[PDB]
Amino acid sequence: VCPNIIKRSAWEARETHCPKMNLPAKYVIIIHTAGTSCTVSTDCQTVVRNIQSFHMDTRNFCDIGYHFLVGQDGGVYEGVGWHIQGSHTYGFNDIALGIAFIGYFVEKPPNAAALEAAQDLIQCAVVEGYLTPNYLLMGHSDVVNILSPGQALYNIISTWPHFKH
Ligand code: NI
């Protein structure tokens, strides 16, 4: 089933009212925050909260851009959740679940804990119906010109199921 998942309230997320996400989604997009990483609950909560603020105040997004985030503490963090539209990839925000690893992974990849959490989340997504049974998995850089989710992480997710080979 779905891994733990720490809620928005847990990281003192600014409350908003954003466009709704249309489920089921047809894709999963692996992203990396490209910023600092985190190894313990409190640190990750902080980093996630800062990203929301940055996305809302200087990027003008309606809320944090990712549906979910994954830390090196192996924990899954709720972004805007399953039901809100994302702000992570042009042309895919209404049909793709954006999952972002907290950190910068071009050279070194996320630990096994982080990776496992992602796949378990992905698994419950398709099982729960948040994703179509024939959904497609892809990396950020496959869709737009972006240095995400990092070659290291890319090489990893490229081997997961439903990856758009
Ligand atoms: Ni599970």
Coordinates of C-alpha atoms and ligand atoms in Angstrom, one line a residue:
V1 CA 0.0 0.0 0.0
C2 CA 1.0 3.7 0.2
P3 CA 4.0 4.4 2.3
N4 CA 3.5 6.7 5.4
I5 CA 3.3 10.1 3.7
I6 CA 3.8 13.1 6.0
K7 CA 1.0 15.7 5.5
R8 CA 1.1 19.3 4.5
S9 CA 0.0 20.4 8.0
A10 CA 3.1 18.5 9.3
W11 CA 5.4 20.9 7.4
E12 CA 3.2 23.9 8.2
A13 CA 2.2 24.3 4.6
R14 CA 0.6 27.6 3.6
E15 CA -3.0 26.8 2.9
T16 CA -4.3 27.5 -0.6
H17 CA -7.1 26.8 -3.1
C18 CA -5.7 25.7 -6.3
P19 CA -7.0 24.1 -9.6
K20 CA -8.1 20.5 -9.2
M21 CA -6.2 17.6 -10.6
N22 CA -8.1 15.3 -13.0
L23 CA -7.7 11.6 -11.9
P24 CA -6.6 9.2 -13.0
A25 CA -3.3 10.6 -14.2
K26 CA -1.7 9.0 -17.3
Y27 CA 2.0 9.7 -16.4
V28 CA 4.5 9.8 -13.6
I29 CA 7.4 12.3 -13.8
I30 CA 10.5 11.9 -11.7
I31 CA 12.0 15.2 -10.7
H32 CA 14.7 16.3 -8.3
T33 CA 14.5 19.6 -6.4
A34 CA 18.1 20.3 -7.5
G35 CA 18.6 21.9 -4.2
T36 CA 19.9 20.7 -0.8
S37 CA 18.9 17.3 0.4
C38 CA 17.7 16.2 3.9
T39 CA 18.2 13.1 6.1
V40 CA 15.8 13.7 9.0
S41 CA 12.1 14.5 9.3
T42 CA 12.4 18.0 10.7
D43 CA 15.0 19.0 8.0
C44 CA 12.9 17.7 5.2
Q45 CA 9.9 19.5 6.5
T46 CA 11.8 22.7 6.5
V47 CA 13.2 22.3 3.0
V48 CA 9.7 21.4 1.7
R49 CA 8.2 24.4 3.3
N50 CA 10.8 26.7 1.8
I51 CA 10.2 25.3 -1.6
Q52 CA 6.5 26.0 -1.3
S53 CA 7.3 29.6 -0.4
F54 CA 9.7 30.0 -3.2
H55 CA 7.3 28.5 -5.7
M56 CA 4.5 30.8 -4.5
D57 CA 6.3 34.0 -3.9
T58 CA 9.0 34.3 -6.6
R59 CA 7.7 31.8 -9.2
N60 CA 4.0 32.8 -8.7
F61 CA 2.8 29.2 -8.7
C62 CA -0.5 28.5 -6.9
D63 CA 1.2 26.2 -4.4
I64 CA 4.3 24.0 -4.2
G65 CA 4.7 22.5 -7.7
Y66 CA 5.0 18.8 -6.9
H67 CA 2.4 16.3 -5.9
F68 CA 4.8 14.4 -3.7
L69 CA 8.4 14.7 -2.6
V70 CA 10.9 12.0 -1.3
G71 CA 13.7 12.7 1.3
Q72 CA 16.9 10.9 2.1
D73 CA 15.2 10.0 5.4
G74 CA 13.2 7.6 3.2
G75 CA 10.0 9.5 3.9
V76 CA 7.3 10.6 1.5
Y77 CA 6.1 14.2 1.8
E78 CA 2.8 15.4 0.5
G79 CA 3.2 18.2 -2.0
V80 CA -0.2 19.4 -3.2
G81 CA -1.4 15.9 -2.8
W82 CA -3.3 13.6 -5.3
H83 CA -6.1 15.9 -6.0
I84 CA -4.5 19.2 -6.9
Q85 CA -3.0 20.2 -10.3
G86 CA 0.8 20.3 -10.4
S87 CA 3.1 23.1 -11.5
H88 CA 6.2 21.0 -12.4
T89 CA 6.2 20.4 -16.1
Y90 CA 4.9 22.4 -19.0
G91 CA 1.9 20.7 -20.7
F92 CA 1.7 17.8 -18.2
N93 CA 0.5 19.4 -14.9
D94 CA -3.0 18.2 -15.4
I95 CA -2.2 14.6 -16.5
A96 CA 1.1 13.7 -14.7
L97 CA 2.0 13.0 -11.1
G98 CA 5.1 14.9 -10.3
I99 CA 7.2 13.1 -7.7
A100 CA 10.4 15.0 -6.7
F101 CA 13.4 13.7 -4.8
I102 CA 14.7 16.2 -2.3
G103 CA 18.3 16.9 -3.3
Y104 CA 20.6 17.1 -6.3
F105 CA 21.2 13.8 -8.1
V106 CA 23.2 14.3 -11.3
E107 CA 26.4 12.6 -10.0
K108 CA 25.2 10.6 -7.0
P109 CA 21.7 9.0 -6.7
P110 CA 19.2 8.9 -3.8
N111 CA 19.6 6.2 -1.2
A112 CA 17.8 2.9 -1.4
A113 CA 15.3 4.1 1.2
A114 CA 14.2 7.1 -0.9
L115 CA 14.0 5.0 -4.1
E116 CA 12.0 2.3 -2.3
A117 CA 9.5 4.9 -1.0
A118 CA 9.0 6.2 -4.5
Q119 CA 8.2 2.9 -6.0
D120 CA 5.9 1.9 -3.2
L121 CA 4.1 5.2 -3.6
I122 CA 3.9 4.7 -7.4
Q123 CA 2.6 1.2 -6.7
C124 CA -0.3 2.3 -4.5
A125 CA -1.0 5.1 -7.1
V126 CA -1.8 2.6 -9.8
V127 CA -3.4 0.1 -7.4
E128 CA -5.6 2.9 -5.9
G129 CA -6.6 4.2 -9.2
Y130 CA -4.7 7.6 -9.0
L131 CA -2.9 6.4 -12.1
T132 CA -4.2 4.5 -15.2
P133 CA -3.2 0.8 -15.3
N134 CA -1.2 1.6 -18.5
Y135 CA 0.4 4.8 -17.2
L136 CA 3.8 5.9 -18.5
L137 CA 6.8 6.7 -16.4
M138 CA 9.4 9.3 -17.4
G139 CA 12.0 11.7 -16.2
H140 CA 11.7 15.5 -16.2
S141 CA 14.4 15.9 -18.9
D142 CA 12.5 13.6 -21.3
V143 CA 9.7 16.2 -21.6
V144 CA 11.4 19.6 -21.3
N145 CA 14.9 21.0 -21.5
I146 CA 15.8 20.8 -17.8
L147 CA 18.6 19.5 -15.6
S148 CA 16.3 17.2 -13.7
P149 CA 16.1 14.6 -12.2
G150 CA 19.9 14.2 -12.7
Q151 CA 21.7 11.6 -14.8
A152 CA 22.3 9.4 -11.7
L153 CA 18.7 9.3 -10.7
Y154 CA 17.7 9.1 -14.4
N155 CA 19.7 6.0 -14.9
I156 CA 17.9 4.4 -12.0
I157 CA 14.3 5.2 -12.8
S158 CA 15.0 4.3 -16.4
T159 CA 15.0 0.7 -15.2
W160 CA 11.6 0.9 -13.4
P161 CA 8.4 -0.5 -14.8
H162 CA 6.4 1.4 -17.5
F163 CA 9.4 3.6 -18.2
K164 CA 8.9 5.1 -21.7
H165 CA 11.9 3.1 -23.1
Ligands
NI1 NI 2.8 -0.6 -0.5

